[model samples]
Target chain A: IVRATVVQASTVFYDTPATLDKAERLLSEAAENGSQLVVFPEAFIGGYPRGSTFELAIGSRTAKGRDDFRKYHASAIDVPGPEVERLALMAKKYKVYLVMGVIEREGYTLYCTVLFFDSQGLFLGKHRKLMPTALERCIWGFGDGSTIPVFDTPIGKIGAAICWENRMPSLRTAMYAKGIEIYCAPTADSRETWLASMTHIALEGGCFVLSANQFCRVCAGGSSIISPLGIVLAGPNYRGEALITADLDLGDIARAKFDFDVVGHYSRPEVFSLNIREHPRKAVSFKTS
Target chain B: IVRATVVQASTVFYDTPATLDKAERLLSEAAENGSQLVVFPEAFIGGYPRGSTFELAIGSRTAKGRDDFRKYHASAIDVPGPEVERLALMAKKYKVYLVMGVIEREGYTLYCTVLFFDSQGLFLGKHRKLMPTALERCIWGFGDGSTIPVFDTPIGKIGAAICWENRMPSLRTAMYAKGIEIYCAPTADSRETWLASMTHIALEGGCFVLSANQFCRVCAGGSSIISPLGIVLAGPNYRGEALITADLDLGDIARAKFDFDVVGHYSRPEVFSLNIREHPRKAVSFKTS
Candidate 1:
């Protein structure tokens, strides 16, 4: 059995230091309440930039939007920088595995990413959002398959997909092939329809799904924890700044998979197959002759 | 605008003739109600075979199960047989495109299949269920990718996928790539969770989704018509023997696609790609020198 918590809270928008502080406080609370695994909402560190246009329009760019973009960009943190180190320390201090959503700044590009940290204070890896939804495309860069990682922990195998990336069927199949037990989906979408996606994923993957969303300006926070049977184990809570926790019996996955293990007996590999290329896509490749 | 109807009714178990008669009656009713397109539940003709196990057990098969299998195999119909001709005639008489589910018999194997018929009485191609769920694998043969086709009609581009085949992400992606306008999912699943899947598909595919399910002893009907934006345009009715109708503006697909057409601007092909093998796989291939 694993005790997991999905933190549904607001980001201290455009303030990275304050947001890190808030994340630490929330992490402390969850660890105190006996959570072995804790997940923060998508873009919890650098902020989702909800309700901000960044001055985008079809075939045109505004200076004001550029200014807004500059401010948002300033708030993003370097992946291996001090912000990530602090987060790693927090996980070690609490003795819990951490799945955190952050906006990763690499040069001039910003990628929405989820950082994985083990209880031993090791930064496992990160999964950048492969596809950003709608207007988000204007500001955030796309992630390649190279970053999609599933880390096997003492509790279980943990993996994550950010926001609408969960909607990608091919991506889900890849993750399922990896035998992911704890599926984390940190999203910004808080609509009633969002819960359905999470529930369907849980049932389809035959794994525990912990989805956390912001309860701030742009999102209403419909964070949830689900079992392999599509049962809502915890919150689709609209209540602000809440820590929704659930006790997940890992054995239930075996019970559910007895009849329907999607990638197992349920799939017909003879009829269909999915191929994913994991090489990093770089615009410029330097060759040493 | 297209008027579409999803029929939710019981099948006269083991009685193909009676089931055909029942289907004709329901199709007539929907056509009279001014429907341009009609969809029937999975295994509407040959029956879903709700409670019969065909004597299936681990590492063993019983004589009684063989007897049950014989009855089911007898109930199935040939694709181009007289029954299919009769269905074509029904479509002509009703002046509506028909998407009907049936158990298809090819030699000794039975396949869960959906037959398509245009209003002009022409028999369109069929989409055989690629992956049958759990116990279904015992009775139904797998379908190859060749049959996964979308037909272009004056009303729209129509296609059908049977039961849990809708859960296959690769299959869904293939259909989306074909630019299916009216996506018909004839299913045996009637649980509340089914609706969420239908709604999510509508939103994800940016196409109108018409899902029909059996309202019989084993399955309670949850037939629904959903818009591209995940709106429940018609009934997810639990009530038995009902025709759920919805007027779909074909233009709505484009509007929905503007923000989220999963196969269109929303896809990241640079990182991920799906390769589908569409040739028919035959057990025996003879070569003449």
Candidate 2:
């Protein structure tokens, strides 16, 4: 039996004590609940969309954006920092694999990160969010293509493409080809439609889905664990805190894939080449017919 | 004027020189060069799959299958005979209109047929293989559903799906919806893929689909013109020989709906519904940290 858990908590900017306490609580609860895996929302470590809504006017006296950026930086945890190490230790102590969202700081800039820890407290690795949705582009540096990857785990191979980042087909295809079994979706989106997108990927991709988002963009998300067929086994809300968990059985993954393997039977790439070109659509002409 | 045609050939028992001649030359050629609105091949009028094979005893003289049907109807004229009349009649007589296959009584049973005619006596259409390919069940009848359906016509709609049907979604949807300008399908499939089944209906309703088929099956023909939006334009294709025709202007059809239009600006449903799709991205379960 494979068991997974999703953590839902109010937003907390990087390194805050309250955030750390809740994070640890969820990890401990999931382990206590016999969940082999646990995941949290994007920027779960620090915060998100830092300057997304701040004003940028000609007569502004306060370097508001800079102040906001600095606060974000302060909230972010260093990749190998002590707090992160302590969390790793908890994973080992509890014998539960953990997936957490964090504000990863390196030098000056902070990036959106998802860190993986094994039940033995080993730091597996982490993926930076690749692209920023529209306005957030101002504060975040785009994650280079290299950040898109799959994590090997005892429960199943897993990976994430973050919130709106889910909209990009190319990114989704890349993940599909990796044959990732359990998908961890970390987000800050508050819209209902966004929730639909999360559950759907589970159905179409035939993989177990573990998603978490802070109720307040200020925090991260209301978490939910979804089945490969898009059924929400647990999750979703707009309040305080909750740990959404689900039992995982790799059997469904095997069942879904037996007939239509994304990387296997369902695909025939030779005949289909991605035709996106460097120039423009102008080179081609079309009539109304 | 973007003009295209749909058909529902009768299912009697055809296969004669005279009948076939009437179908091949006259009906097909005329439309091939003339009005541009024409399609054929459902039961092809006379008939297909005569059932003698299933009805016949192990080693009987009269049971070579529907061969007797073809022979008895052997007197049926082909493209070369008076058939050129039906084909040429439109072009030859009426000037420009497409007609479905004109099944004639060959001798005993019958063979399925196709025929198209123009304003000047030119025939279009072919003799579909009598037997349905593979487990077409009973007698091995005649003609290939013929890749004969795909071609360039002045009016646009092109490609056909008749009877037993093409099973692949990419094959038919890509061919008729995304590629072909005119999708003319003459089918007699059932509810489990029924003649007027949702599959056929969807095919027609999904594109600038024109479906013309014989009125009665063991039940409904429901042939009609469907808008790309699934709206039934002509309603049901049923009862009696019908001269069902539509003066289509595709440019106008392509106007109002572009968001999810299969032929144009529509978002790829695959990508749009990717998240909640119920199937996770197919990837290897690289269980990691």
Instruction: State fnat for each of the candidate structures.
Output: 0.59, 0.00
- Expressed as tens digits, the lDDT of each residue in A1-289 for candidate 2 is 7776676665555457677777666566666756677677777667655446656555474668678667666766787888787887777776677778777676676677778877787887778776565566556665554456677765668887676666444455567867888877877766544555565466557777777776653544466777765466775755666666668878877776543345454333432223221222233598895
On lDDT, the candidate that comes out on top is 1
Give the lowest summed-lDDT range of ten residues in model 1 chain B.
B212-221
lDDT of each: 0.78, 0.55
Among all windows of 10 consecutive residues in model 2 chain A, the one with the lowest summed lDDT is: A272-281
Best by DockQ: 1
TM-score of chain B of 2: 0.57
Q: Write the per-residue lDDT of candidate 2 for residues B1-289, one digit (tens) a residue.
A: 6554554445445443344454445445435543456565465544544323444565464645556544645544443565455446445645454556444443333444555444456554553422343444243344422224444445554555545333222234345443565555565543312322332334323456666555444644556676554455565655655545565667755552432244233223322222111122323678778
- Whose TM-score is greatest here? 1
The residue-level lDDT of candidate 1 at B35 comes to: 73
Write candidate 1's Cα lDDT for B1-289 as tens digits: 8788877887877778877788777777776767787777777778776666676678588678777778778887897989988888777775777778888788899988888887789877887777677787777787776787868888878887777767767778888898898888877766777887677787778778888777765456788888788778776788666778878898887777776667777667877787777787777999999
